[PDB]
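Retro notes
What went well: the complex prediction finally ran end to end.
Inputs used:
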Amino acid sequence: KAYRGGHLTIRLALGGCTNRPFYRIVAAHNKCPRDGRFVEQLGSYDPLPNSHGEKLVALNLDRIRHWIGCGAHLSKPMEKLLGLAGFFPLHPMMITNAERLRRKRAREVLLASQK
Amino acid sequence: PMKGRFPIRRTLQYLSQGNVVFKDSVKVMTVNYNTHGELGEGARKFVFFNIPQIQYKNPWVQIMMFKNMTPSPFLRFYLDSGEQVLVDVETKSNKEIMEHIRKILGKNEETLREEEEEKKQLSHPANFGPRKYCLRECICEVEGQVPCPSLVPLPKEMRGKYKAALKA
Amino acid sequence: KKVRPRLIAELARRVRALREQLNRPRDSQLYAVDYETLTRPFSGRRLPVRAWADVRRESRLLQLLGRLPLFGLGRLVTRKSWLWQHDEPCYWRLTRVRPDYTAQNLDHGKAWGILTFKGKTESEAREIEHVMYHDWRLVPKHEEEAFTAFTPAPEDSLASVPYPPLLRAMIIAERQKNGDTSTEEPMLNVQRIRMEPWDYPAKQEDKGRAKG
Amino acid sequence: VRSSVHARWIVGKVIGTKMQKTAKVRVTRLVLDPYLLKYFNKRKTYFAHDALQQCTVGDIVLLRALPVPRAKHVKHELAEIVFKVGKVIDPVTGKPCAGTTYLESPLSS
Amino acid sequence: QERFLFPEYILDPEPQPTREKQLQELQEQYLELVSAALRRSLVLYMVDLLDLLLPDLPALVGPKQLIVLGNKVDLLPQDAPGYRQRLRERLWEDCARALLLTVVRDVRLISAKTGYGVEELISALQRSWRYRGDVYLVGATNAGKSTLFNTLLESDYCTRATISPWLNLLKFPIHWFYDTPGITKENCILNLLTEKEVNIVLPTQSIVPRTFVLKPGMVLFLGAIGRIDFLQGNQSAWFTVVASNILPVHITSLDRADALYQKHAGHTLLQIPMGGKERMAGFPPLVAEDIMLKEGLGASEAVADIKFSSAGWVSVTPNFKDRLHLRGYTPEGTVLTVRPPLLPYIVNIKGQRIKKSVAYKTK
RNA sequence: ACCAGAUCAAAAGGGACAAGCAUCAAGCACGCAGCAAUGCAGCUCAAAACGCUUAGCCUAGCCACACCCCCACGGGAAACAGCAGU
Ligand code: FES
Ligand SMILES: [Mg+2]
Ligand SMILES: [Mg+2]
Ligand SMILES: [Mg+2]
């Protein structure tokens, strides 16, 4: 199907059954459906901690580099995952959400203590 | 039973046995041979037995035959570069002809193995998808990870049906 | 196998093209505004909240040029947004103008100027953007030199930055595998990257236009 | 080289010469019957441009894809008359032959 | 820098160039002159099968041998097996109504356009003693006399053609064949229609019946020439239009039928006539004619064919025991005719209802 | 961010590509040469042309439709084949 515009984007396809999310890191034409056709699958991601308490992430770094070079963009979740991986700098919103969480914790601690 | 002499010729197991895979340069092959002649018996047997294998292994290489066009039998390959390779087959057995053509125009086992590696690259184990393409459909298949909800119900803590209950 | 030609499809395409061409709306129509509802009458869309005060209080570039000789050609025009955002002088030289005469007060149209941003000028005059916006202001003939007096601040900046941890590790490992035991840190040059403020004027020449 | 036509080189049989400078060549490809697994001579018609009009009905010809289709159907040019009808020269011995019998014996020269 | 153009000597464009038009471009005398000669031999009377002068033949030609030729048979759809035999029979009863079976010795069905039956007609002509002397080809204007004459001339029947005064007419030797002037038809929509309109109306390809299921209080429009209003019907019914495939058929309610008629007169929705309001001003208004249909003979046998002169007809099948009231609107000058069904089993050939639309898929 | 060639993939050209019916056997311009005039009179087809009937397909998905008039200027007419619902 001819697409008017659009561009490659490295993103996540939400597979897995209900209440059991699981993501396939794929490089697909941005206009294509979320779980639909995709140019190439670059890895996978399991949000639910496994028996070892690990959120497994597989990133085919070679192909990820190749596609970023070819000009694929990066969805915010993928940028955050790469930042956690250390392949990219920590996302500004990751840092700022950490700080917001810290302030929330400080506020809640103060409120609980000031009974 | 299967019809015709040497019905084995009409089985994939035999057709795939062809070891001759022409280089991409070859585009056409013409087999001139005589239906009679003791010397041409080798060429006749070659046409009867091996040509099907060559064609099966080289679907795009056109193959055409010519009965009793010239006193002597021969093959002639026309390459993409316009070159013409004339191969004499008189007095040769079909096996000898096959080996000669393999030597002079067939891809070597090294090239074939290289093609095999290029092909197998596609089947990345780490990828997940329908059995048709990837080994595992969902990471749940991997042991240690949270198993699929269908086979094993998730804890009430993880099911969103009760996260909303907590929300209330 | 032969296809049946789509004559009516071709006619529709050509007719729509011609209709758009011959009824191409005027600027005074497209970029009108209702200062009561802050809605553009032509399309009926309401302007975003953050532009309400600016639309009510400030004036447009051509709305100013209409009160100058040669449409103020050769004057320096600055934007209120620029003045608020940056302490450095930013403005256009306004080399050329082309108003929409059809407007009653000739307060719409196009302009071309030499951009000076943050006190750094450009090499050529190009088309303006956001002409239709309301955040424009005029540099008075007097005070022009004092206002545009810009002291070039020291521009020296980081030549390179560290790689992200994993990329650094990958590069180092590849080097060691190749035997390149040079322990010098791997750095990523950034001078090549010309960072520009998000509000920097864009190429109006490649911008689109509204339609009816 | 970078021809837009599909089949670069094809050997066929001339089966018509009722078109100016154009010869109607029939090309036969062995095709695998998916069921019987026997190969059959599927045939297709091609038009070869012949400037010299040297094609004769029954000749075996080699056709080279033109760089671009020069007509609604003319997509090849006659590269070489492989076997002039009834004037076959044994490529092996280069001597003329009539069927399976040499005209000039190879020992002639 | 600067330039100017001159409001004098101007060259100017036009308003509303209307490329739509461009694409529209892109995409008694016989009695008093000829009967005297004829009544001095064989007569070939050509009758248009679609249009069904016969009773006046005894005075026109006199008491001589006559052969009936039903023309334009190929354009008639095959409603049911043996329809050719049924048509031959129908012609036979029509002649009996009007004549000895003047004597008519043979009734045959021919199609000059397709050359169907012409050779058999020639063989019959040459096979028997009874057919000796000259041949006079009599018929109406649209019957196809010209086509049949050309066909016979281009055949072994003739021993090339000459023109002789009777009025100069064509002839060829066989004794001489005589092609008489065509008898013009009165009250014909073709007379009102122009050359292009007549060409469109006249079917050049085999007709495809178009069936439509209609409930009481509805209206059908065959071009802008014919209209039918179905009402006072105890049950729904089916109407099969047999007309030129390129004649639009439009179905509407009785309320909107008029307003649509004025709005779309001419134009393209009702492609006949053409010229818009200009042509419609001269075009006669559609006068009304009331009709009552007999008991509905099932849902497969037509009860009546309503013919709008030469444009076409509509076969009506009501439901069993159902009696329907109809009002046919036809141009003032021309006439509307209710006749026994020419193709009574034409309703059967059809497909299936498409959407809520009354139309049936055409087979 | 620009260019880069890279990636993606239209239109166009070549090839490939469902089922039944021959009680669908001829299609009727379906070809070629020439810069053009113009000439040549050819082209497909019992190895199934042409035509009628049925069907979404070769499923990470793909093709097509978007109420109808194949299209949609225009007209018919007021459109859930988006979700929930009648
Ligand atoms: S298929 Fe993987 S969680 Fe169910
Ligand atoms: Mg549509
Ligand atoms: Mg609907
Ligand atoms: Mg619904």
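What we learned: The beta strands of chain A are 8-15, 22-29, 40-45, 57-59, 73-74.
What to try next: split runs per interface for comparison.
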